[PDB]
């Protein structure tokens, strides 16, 4: 059918040419709750609304501060690799966090003491590469598709430092001197970057492990998130990875949230920093409460980026018939939330009643234990 | 069917949950031309992706620098009024330009010499209100739906100055002193803004005309764009309104462009300033050429805002079976373009051939007359 | 007596040590109108709250963006000269506008074509010196005290270019070459700036007039404001000087406003730019209406600087038993205001009634002629 | 010999490894005048200290805000073309002003009404191309070397819009549709920019002139500066070109100054805007007087860029045995200066004496006529 | 001879007046490698190109963000003191790091617990003074010349806080009250700063040591860098001082690099922060690789400051017949580099071959041990 921006006696039918498919995807934007009010920045952007860079071996598309200007500290790439295909040896200023949505991949990293780490990463696994440390990704037999987050919103995917691009713009006489070889011995070097290229599948992980004089890295750069025990509550599950458990992950804290149909990520805020969101599957709505009587509701579905500025109140409600699965990402060394429910449960009941003009029948339902995801009754 | 980001031997199928409706709307973003290259800012945003403010009497939703950060100088509201309904007497810092897409409306404006102008505006008509001059809109029997452009990208629709909001936050004793009345005589003033409110239809325009001691305004604040003779070329029509013909319109230059199926707005640029676009109907693609080998293609359809920064090369191609109708908007006192075709036609043919590695068979087709919209052969 | 921040059942007595003299000067800040609301920037600063630079011959103290951060475009100096005393030949980047509050003075200016202008300025007279044109002030037999406004808020009075400071930091060999003299002939030049210095009274103006080969300046740099016919209304008078009458005054528009006891500068705004205010005498209050339900009331008395950002609604009410006299200053080539009264008077009466929920008894009092200053009944 | 930073009893010999050639070029920086004082920004940069872009057909090197951060509004390219060689058809956001130091060249320009202008430019001639209007340069039989100034300091020479780069990043199907040709007919288009390329010498100017339906351009884009009558004074000559004589040159005012050995550009300032300088030949020093007792002396020779911020006092002294020849460039619609000598000459003599602690023997030498360049006695 | 900007068939002879001495110093800027490409900021500035402040007792000249705008975080002073001469007791906001190139000096520092440290510093020794802690320098019998680095690029040497300048601008009655003395007892205080002044040589260090009630400082503020064991490789030596060995040096990490003739600091980058460079002796070239196919080569010799932004690839090659000696400086708590050679050595050989289109003959030369400086074969 044909949705209209009408709420009781407010609003009207659209009379100009319009985008009905988009209107259908955004029911709480075309018809917001009556409780929404005031100017709030856009907190919503789709990867589908971005240019996709296509290469032999896969693709890469990004949502940055140029697409979503509220998110100045965090940016993201949706990258896809075909079986065997390689994301070229490269480095950047930004730390990089990743979540493997589909497939698997081999990563390499060498640290500033010349110690190497090589590991395979499967669905639900993470990696984190600290700023400036060089790395690669090679998809295994299924290919790979993953979400990357970089800890600067001004990140430009096209502007990373690539091995072959470095060498293509270094004098041949210097490269030859650097390695103790002749110019003729390096005449076959590529003339330009590769970036993403097709390649034969690698062999077993154990055969790739490189031994060196410098030791093992002190902490792994991968983490098996879904192998961890989640916080379990009535309507879903939360898996947290920050620097307290995934030790190397100093600038990125993360949680994978699953919300069953009829459930919601409860009313809460984060007392530490802004939240950046990626919707893996399902359909949600979220109201962002911006203080001073400002609040705005957004719709999200698979492929969307979301954002909640520092300390703004919010919830994420599943509004579909399938599980809602999304990531909460923070540029910090730890995850933290304040639960509205638990906060009030931990205060004298008469004081809460004095605030809410409600009685014992309300303060009796409050829980001193935090349940991040709650189920509707 | 199911589009995939695949171009020959480049790209791959999407393996994660995805937004197929959006992918279908953006064929040249999911599968860009091979000639696209480099980081280019987002130049595309849908009104469907914004919060819609619903009121008794209609609605208002906006695309600003908070949604589309490239557009720092220009912002826009899609406003809808039901029959008789009034957009409250108000003013703002920004100059306001409008295009009436549907219906009709009565506007009022009083200038800084106390001269008034009251006029009815129909489909295809414009208004322009200079910065800071107070005005109103009242829809007539059909209702009204129109596009507003303000000459600051930081514009916030919720933050305009409203008559009743001014009075609600002025001391009653001061209002009473201002008008020579008692506080009791103004006790019924509204306690808060109205903004948009339902009202009975007005009478005939001739009965509303207010006479004053200060004279007629020197220039009208409305303009009948579609009553003008357009530039006509093979594939469509261009109607231009800037300060040279619509005299009051000092900070906004505009053109309505119609492009037939199988036609395109030719390769050109604007030598004066950035272009802001609104797609009224149809489906388009545009490549923005950003220099230094940077170019990015965008898709647009009805309800979309587009942008072309100052001097970037572009075209707008109709990719549907219906007419493509869009507005080109500039914060300047005049419209100007440089046609790629006419530029080259006006140079010595051997000099052009020396540039393009093409011969007489090419330079023979160039035209010294500008045809803004051309038809495919 | 002892004022308390109490308004009906709101507020409380001050319980900590406090500044009672300041509280007494700010009755509408200690006890604001109930109609005030929200965060509004400070719009008020006293010259008494600034460091006064004392020199042999007088003094200078300033209110800049460093004191009043809302005023980024306009800054001000209160300067005093004793009889005969000279404000050293100097120039600056900023244009300078002045109002002579007390005494009289001789000014000199030489333009970029080598044409000179020398004139005497009395109480109520203005000068304007365009950016970068060199000038001096010498007080006559009464001394002089005047208010200066510069068209940059970052102005620093201590940082102007002085004749003798230029020469003190130029090599003697270069100064000698510049003028065709020996180094010995200029050995007595000052080692440092003078800035303000005592000097004998000058002779008659007619004896100082310098004739040159380059002609008379096309427009005078002084203006006799109080010799003009003011706009007269019931409660006071407005004298306007902008570039339309005081021709050289291209970047500063000004009005001197006198408001009788029991009168007010009516509810209005300026559709062109921000207003900067100086209170010469009397006591006032003003509410600044900042849109979106924001309004804040300020008190002012002699020696205060005030400010009203671009298009904000305001009035200035006399709250004392003596005349209120203040300047309204604008960085623009013209003065303009929109009168709330005249605006509504120029609209259909039923339309105004529909806005205000008031009837004919109200719209009957509106006046189509603007009266900037109105008297209480 | 070996210069040392020693001035009387101040300073000391350099004890670390040092750049003696640079020290020799900067005698007034290694040993500044005793009258210099305080922090002043760098106002000096050499083209010799920049990367030179070498192409088949010539070279281009630039001094921008990235080299000289004080110059935020103006940037410059030193470009060289071999005989016949072409600087590719291109456009940019910035207006472009040029001075032909060596050789000659043919320029083309087409304006936004499709009117063309084609002209030959010789040593001492100028061109000005308004922002966004497309143009080319082709050197004639002697080759050409010229100085370009762009009216934005952030200009990046590598980032201009080139004809062939536009076409290389536009879909072939779109280019074909634009011109009414087949894709096969344009298959030979270049794959990348040319920028500068070798080409056969053009024929006579008269044979290149293109006639069109749109008329002659209203104003020429070239100007014969050295054919004008200069201001002549004792020590040299000044040729001025601004928008009052070179009509199209709206954003750039310029003067070519020649200073004989033993002469100087007198003590003056500019009351309108900053000055950007290029030293064509000879050797100079200049003291920049920055107010508040700040002054710093700089050395300049051929290939140097200089700068004087808005209203700062200065002189330019020839310190070599050959003529000193330099350009003074301003982002404005007019040239203006205030002469220290003429300023003081136009004031009462006793008033000047009171300032300078000097007598009639000094004020007697002052001249009411401006002599921009003066000769030492 | 006379260098020309010609590389094979690219470039041309210079036809305008030029700076041949500078061209000779910059062979890789006049004729860059063909592998250089794109706009890169200036990364090069000479102390010889700065104003030298001369005082009785020595001199000081600086390279700041005003000279080298890329270096926003780090600034530098080249200071020289004659035997016995004192750099006045002073403090500043910035932390200060120093390297003693010539001579020796006595430093004093008192920390915020009133603990003092007094020590003599010789050639190759360092000091570090934390932000805001007061200090002095007095040259011993040889005089002293040293390089200072401050951890803010906006540093202004003329704007430090000096003991005597503090007292000269404090009321005498307050100074007298502060110390319990009469105004007459302090009447001989200087009227202005000293900054640098001549003084008799101090006695033995042991006689100056001041004992106090507050203890010894926990960490020394000097460090004997050249007494440390350097990293030794074939073509030179690297001495590192950061907060891990020179404990107080929390905001500055440093390395002294010596590169023999025919050697180079290998291809590497820094994964932590920008590098600031000072060339003590010799002649170098360095290519800065800026990503996205951007690279620019610079020449450096004694007296030059260099810069490499965060993570950009680089090498430093000795291009003279004497040792090359330079400092690498970082605003961080540690030194770190990633060696291109070691990185690739630590990866599977077939993976490296797949990247470089090179075989076993290349990957066989890679070394798992880092050699910062390598010798040509
Ligand atoms: Mn990466
Ligand atoms: Mn959250
Ligand atoms: Mn409006
Ligand atoms: Mn266009
Ligand atoms: Mn002045
Ligand atoms: Mn006002
Ligand atoms: Mn150009
Ligand atoms: Mn000048
Ligand atoms: Mn220090
Ligand atoms: Mn390094």
Which CATH architecture of the largest domain in chain A is right? Sandwich
Spatial separation of the terminal alpha carbons of chain A: 29 Å
Cα-atom radius of gyration of chain A? 24 Å
Number of domains of chain A: 2
- Distinct small molecules: manganese (II) ion
| The CATH H-level homologous superfamily of the largest domain in chain A | Jelly Rolls
Overview features:
part of a larger assembly, 5 chains, 377 residues, mainly beta, 2 domains, 12% helix, binds manganese (II) ion, GPI/OXD (chains A, B, C, D, E), oxalate decarboxylase activity (chains A, B, C, D, E), metal-binding (chains A, B, C, D, E), manganese (chains A, B, C, D, E)
How would you explain this protein's 3D organization?
This is part of a larger assembly, with 5 copies of chain A (377 residues). Chain A has helices at residues 20-25, 27-30, 163-168, 172-179, 205-208, 340-345, 349-356, 360-363; strands at 6-7, 10-11, 44-46, 53-55, 58-63, 75-81, 86-91, 96-110, 116-122, 125-129, 135-150, 161-162, 196-197, 222-224, 231-233, 236-241, 253-259, 263-269, 275-281, 283-291, 294-301, 304-308, 314-318, 324-330, 338-339, 373-375. Chain A has 377 residues and is mostly beta strands. In chain A, strands 4, 5, 6, 7, 8, 9, 10, 11, 12, 13 and 14 form an 11-stranded antiparallel β-sheet that branches. Chain A has a 7-stranded antiparallel β-sheet with strand order 3-22-19-24-17-16-15, with no helix packed on it. Chain A is globular, with a radius of gyration of 24 Å. Chains A and B meet through β1, β2, α1, β4 and β6 of A and β1, β2, α1, β4 and β6 of B. The complex binds manganese (II) ion (10 copies). One manganese (II) ion is lined by residues 268, 270, 275, 308, 314, 328 of chain B.
